[PDB]
RNA sequence: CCUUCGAUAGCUCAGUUGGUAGAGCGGAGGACUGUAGAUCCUUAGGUCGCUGGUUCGAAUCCGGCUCGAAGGACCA
C-alpha cells in the first residue's frame, strides 16, 4: 500500500515551503488535485518546463487527482465526457480535449482517467456504464500517444459497474485488459457493509501488477477496512477537516477534541502527553488554547502541522506493519 | 544613576546619524534597529522559527492584551511572556489601551490609574503604575514600559496629560524594584507645540531614567513637522541613553529619522522591494516568472516566483500571508543592515542619494519634506 | 428506446418558491507604521451547459436535445 501527501496548490494547506520542508515523514509523491489546477493550466500552457519547477519542488513525483478528497463526490455529478471536479478549477465542460490540454500544461507523472458510475454513492444502466467507461478509457489511451512529450505520462484505470456486483466484476474484467498503470474505485466515498462487500468483490479480480486507488476514504476505520479489502493508495483529507473546525486529533495508532473549552487553560502539557511527535516539542496546549480563543492563524498552522505529522506517521506505521 | 547602555563607534560627518550597540541580558541590539510589532507578525502566519531565521533580535508586545487574557495571575504563575511565544531574543512591552481613540472609546482615567472595559464584566483588570510594573516584571522583558497618557489631541488636555504622565513616571520609579535587571523608557508628550515639549524634555532630563522615547506624532501631523520635532528632541537629549521612536517603518521615514539621530524604530498581501512597496495582488505581472527580488536573501524570492505566489495568494491564504510577511520583514532587516553599513564606513551622504535613486532615480521626485530635512542636516542631493 | 435526478463567480452550494444573484472557499485595489474591542476597507471576477416557449420581468415556470447521473439494456 501507500499514501499520497495532500497538497493544496503545490504545498500543504496552511504550510509554506520552509514549514512543509520542516514536516517529517514526507513521501516522495505529491498529490495535486486536478480540481485546483485550472488557472495553473492557463499559466503552464506556455511555462514549458513542468509544474515541478513552477512550485519549486521538481524532484517529487506528481499525481493529478480529479476529486479533491475533502469534497470527493455527490449523489452524482460525474459522467464519461467531463468530470465536475469539486475544487478550484475544471468545472466548465472539462471535456477529453480539455483534460488533454490540462495534462499537457501540467505534465504530471501519473494522470488520472475520468471516473464514472455514481451508483455506489442495476443491470441495464450498469452495463451501459461499463461500456461507456471502457470507451472513455480507449479514447484516452488513443489520445495519449498522439504527443511525444505526453507519452512520458501514465494513465490510471477506473472500475465502475452500477449496482449489481456481477456488472462491477465485468467492468473490472474488461478494464483490466487495457494496459493502464493503475486502478480507481469510485462511489465508495466515506463506507458501509454493502459497499464493503462490493469493494471486496471488485478487488477480488483486479490484477496485482497495478496499484489500487480510492476516493473519499480517509477515516482510520474506513482506511483499515479498505486496506483489508486490498486498496493500496489513499487520500489524506481527514486532517484538513479536523483542523478546519478548530479540532485536534486524539486517536492513537501506536477521534477529535474541540479546544474551544475553558478546561484546557490550566494544563501545561502539549496536546500529546510525553510522545515524540512535533506537538510534544513545538509548544504547549495552553498556547494553542489561547490562540484559538484569540483566533490566531499561528494556532491553525501548528494544528495543521501536528495533524499532518500524526496522519503521515499513522500511514507509515500501518505500511510498515503490512509490509513486515 | 541609571547605567548607560549605548556605546558609540560611528557618527555621520555631514549628518546626525549614529551607529551603536545596546546590551541586554537576553541579547545585543544594533542601533539603528527596527522592531516589528510582535502580535501582528505572529498572527499573520509567521512562526517563531521563521521570524528568527531572518536575523531579527528585538520584538514588541502589548501588556494590556496579555492582561485581558488569560490574566495577570496565570501569566505570572508560569512566567508567561518568555516561554509563551517562544521568542528567545529581546522583547519590548507596551502599555497599550491608549490608542488613537483616547477617551472616545476608553474609560476616563481615575486617580489610581486607567480602567478598561471588556465584553465580560469579570474580565476587566486594573492597570496602575505599581500594577503595571508588577505585571511587566512578571513578563520579565528586558525593556519595561511605563504607564503614560498617550494621545493622538489639542488644548490643555495634553497639558494635564503630561502632568499625569510625569506623576506616573515618578510613581513607577518609586515602585520599580530591579533597576539593574530591567530598564524603563520614559515617554515625552506635549501635543503639537514645542515649548511645552521643551519643558517636558527639561523634567525628563532632570530624572535619570535609563531610556527616552517620543510619542503622539504619527497619524496627527505631517512628516515635515514630525521630523523637525524628532530632530529637536534628539538634539536636546544626550547621546548616552537610547532614543525610541513610534509610528515608523517606511523606508524613507526610517532613513530620514536615522539621519536625524534615532536608534529605535517600531493581514498581509503586499511586498516591499528596493523599487518600493508593491502589492502582490496586482495582475499586471501575475504571468511573469521572475522573482520579486533577485538579490533579496529571503526564501520567497530565491525559491518561488511572482506567478506562483499570485496563484497561491488566496489559494492557500495562510501560506501566502506567511510568505509575504516574512519577505517584508526580511526586506526591512536588509534595509536596516544596509543603512548601518553605510554609516559604518562613511558613505551615507552619498549612499542616501543612491537610496532615493533606488526608488525615484533623481532629486526631483524626492519628497519635499525629505529634501528639506536632508538640506537642514547637511546633505545636499 | 424507455423512467427517475442532475449542469450557477476559479469552485462546493444557498436562491431553484419569478425580481438580473450571494456566503464558505478562489480572486481583485489599498492600508502592515506600539492588533482582541474579530484577517480590515474598497471591489474585480457569473452570456446560471445549450435551444425554444411563457411573463412587465426567468438561474427559477414549461418541453426536449448536446453532455448527463440514476432505472428497464435501442441489442442480451
Ligand atoms: N513604545 C510606544 N509605542 C507607541 C505608539 C504610539 N504611541 C506609543 C508610545 O507611547 N510608546
Numbering used by the authors:
A (entry chain B): 31 to 151, 156 to 224, 228 to 291, 331 to 400
B (entry chain A): 12 to 163, 166 to 279, 288 to 402
Quote the paper.
In most bacteria and eukaryotes, queuosine (Q) is universally found at the wobble position (position 34) of four specific tRNAs featuring “GUN” anticodon sequences, namely tRNATyrGUA, tRNAAspGUC, tRNAAsnGUU, and tRNAHisGUG7,8. Prokaryotes can synthesize Q from GTP de novo, whereas eukaryotes need to salvage the modified nucleoside or the base queuine (q) from their diet and microbiota. In eukaryotes, the incorporation of q into tRNAs is carried out by the tRNA guanine transglycosylase complex (TGT), comprising the catalytic queuine tRNA-ribosyltransferase subunit 1 (QTRT1), and the accessory subunit QTRT2. The Q modification at the wobble position increases the efficiency of decoding during translation.
Structures of mouse QTRT1/2 in complex with mature tRNATyr and pre-tRNATyr by single particle cryo-Electron Microscopy (cryo-EM) confirm that the complex is able to bind both forms in an almost identical fashion. After additional 3D classification and refinement routines, final maps at an overall resolution of 2.9 Å (mQTRT1/2-tRNATyr) and 3.1 Å (mQTRT1/2-pre-tRNATyr 1-4), respectively, were obtained. QTRT2 contributes to tRNA binding by contacting the D-loop and the acceptor stem. The 9dG molecule is visible in the active sites of both structures, which show an overall r.m.s.d.698 residues of 1.13 Å. In summary, our cryo-EM structures confirm that mouse QTRT1/2 is able to accommodate both mature as well as precursor tRNATyr and that G34 is positioned correctly in the active site to accomplish the G-to-Q exchange reaction, regardless of the presence of the intronic sequence.
